[PDB]
DNA sequence: CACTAGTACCTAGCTTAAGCCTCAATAAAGCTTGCC
DNA sequence: GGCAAGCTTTATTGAGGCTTAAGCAGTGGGTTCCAGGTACTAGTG
């Protein structure tokens, strides 16, 4: 707060998508099951308070009533009134087109309510690049609030931070309960899932080590993200469940690591059993989330951006796989969508969900 | 002139406060928890730079040379080590970013020199 | 190099942004005029524009020559990342292509950064159209 | 669910456990920090603490389940840190920039 | 509408200005005037700058460069060791405020005008000694005439805010 | 003669007025000494 | 030593600053939910 009152650090944006999480079915059903399991415990306590004061022993199969844990899930999924709070969480699946079915399963809802005269929760922020489609949005009174996920974007399902904390204590990281407060400002503050776990003195060769473990999947899962803030001495590792990442290629010095032998082993699938996950394991692609996109130098295409010219930067770290993967599922069926105007792309993204067609193969059943 | 720092007690380690000597006409720092006194160093007990002429090179750190997303030059050598390559960037700060001043940081290892062009 | 001098009445940065927007608007206008001197009188874009039935000279300039500067809230594409607009650009890049100027036309098609900046300008237009409706209808109701 | 095919739409939210600094330009606060703190695998929901500088330059904190604007130094003393020097060690990590110490000085001198 | 990069006076024409006319808003988003100049000042940019400075709300904060308070019990020999200290030949803590030359040039102000506004706004409780046009350093030294020491800081905040020069 | 079931009865921001909270002249109320 | 023009006190009374409803463009199509909990009796084992 003092750095913000000085301006030595800029203020924070509410719409930067490094500042947001996506509650999927996992966290949503977990948030529902917390309350409903707690209510089942409360009803078991009420039953036991009734049947100890008669001096008798309770009957435990009558203690646990099953409707409070099943009818509640059935109500919150059948109605969408997410509680006994907000609404519209579970929508009925749209089965007019297979494109509409796919686009309804890849839809994000901003929790900001409707009919607001402001524009900043609705606009196409810069950090929607590659994670969420720029064109597809409902053009009614929910422009920008309801969005559709991009193609290769993937929401990190999250893992436990404890192997990362064991790895940091393995190396020369100094915990907060064992430091002097004099050597803090000449070293980098290191965070895990937000909580500040200690200090480290040498931030380079720590970030190189953490990345070297993620390009091998030794300890750290591929979804977990390291971010070295370089201007202000911080290094933060997120292992949350809900962050939104997308795979990018990896560029050593000025060369892709996607060599010809990977394409040779990758053309011959169902034979070599060489999958995508073998290529993530090979240290060639990796998932970059939105915080880490603020600290990455991203080549658009390799045929332009690793060849020597009047050089732009020559310090690329990642390369985009293909730019057409910034688009959603409904904006992917548009031929030449860069030649159109962008409201026309949005309107087609609306109409492509409404086209008649063979919506499913078992439609006769 | 210069900035004024917070003085500290020696016994209870709280903040010392300015007061006057009615006898010797000198300023004395005095705590409010305990009863400890110190002789002042300067007459300047408060200061307020309002025009905000700050030395931006102090806020620059040397480690920002390791950033890949900063642009490099071989057009400006470092004055100390003579290394030809250096990154360059804006002020990155509020109470600033009205002028577009470049600050250069030499990217050579174990020099870390920064300067203003 | 601090060789730019500030215009009286605004900062050095707003002086700079006036210079950059003035050059790019001059480029859009000069390329727009030099496109529309070459229709050869049978071009159907000119047939609909000259009659005034559908379209304008700006649509001819954007289809043939250059889309032009994309804007969000009346200024250029803001730095949504830390001091850069997209992660493909170097930090503190105030150039044309970094900040949202589209030099391609709809006949050639846009590069993906220009596609995304164009999608930003279009989202601003759709937000305007969707938010305008209720407030204008309520003004009409109060007046009647 | 009852023969009806249901889709859980992914719901955005602000990222938890992460410090943010925003500006309520209409309120009485110049710069307000927040941290929607929520421990993973905890049945209780998130509980946002706010740390906000007053616009006039004291700094206060809005804690959960406490309705008044508690000063920062009150909370640091309430954590068993009695010295002003120790609290200033935990807040300002360099003692060689006197400008930030001068800015925290009125908030420190609220609660002596 | 495109907009003007230069000052552009936030005109907000369209739906919200129509709203501000339709419901009579006592807090409009952008109030303004259109001050037409009378005579030769309408055809002179310099007299128009003079009217421009005589209309714009100029506090002391827009003109000051920095300020500090000091403890000098002997005004004849200050710790700064500047020149005009012999203008004196009462309180030992003083207010040493240094102005820039640029905003004093642009607002067309002098030292004596500022000191007279401070004396008129504060009575005989305050003492102001200014600097002549010898250096760029424009010094005002302010003393209390006869709660304790922080009261001078309180009137420093109450003098940067609303002197209305 | 006991248990259980079936069914019948009991219980996001805006804006603007508008009421409510505090602060500065001011005339009655009573001293106060100045003149008779 | 008593009234009286003036000073001091004391309500006093009109004039500046803080929370709170109440409004917020239109027309069609699908889904879900509106009673549950005890009480008192009949039929069946
Ligand atoms: Zn002490
Ligand atoms: Zn060097």
UniProtKB/Swiss-Prot annotation, chain B:
CDD domains: Zn-ribbon_RPB9. Zn(2+) 2 binds at residues 78, 81, 106, 111. Keywords: Acetylation, DNA-directed RNA polymerase, Metal-binding, Nucleus, Transcription, Zinc, Zinc-finger. One of its GO terms (cellular component) is nucleolus. GO terms for biological process: maintenance of transcriptional fidelity during transcription elongation by RNA polymerase II; transcription by RNA polymerase II; transcription initiation at RNA polymerase II promoter; transcription-coupled nucleotide-excision repair. It comes from the Eukaryota. It is found in: Nucleus, Nucleolus. One of its GO terms (molecular function) is DNA-directed RNA polymerase activity. A zinc finger (TFIIS-type) spans 74-116. DNA-dependent RNA polymerase catalyzes the transcription of DNA into RNA using the four ribonucleoside triphosphates as substrates. Component of RNA polymerase II which synthesizes mRNA precursors and many functional non-coding RNAs. Pol II is the central component of the basal RNA polymerase II transcription machinery. It is composed of mobile elements that move relative to each other. RPB9 is part of the upper jaw surrounding the central large cleft and thought to grab the incoming DNA template. Component of the RNA polymerase II (Pol II) complex consisting of 12 subunits. Belongs to the archaeal RpoM/eukaryotic RPA12/RPB9/RPC11 RNA polymerase family. This is DNA-directed RNA polymerase II subunit RPB9. It comes from Sus scrofa (Pig). The gene is POLR2I.
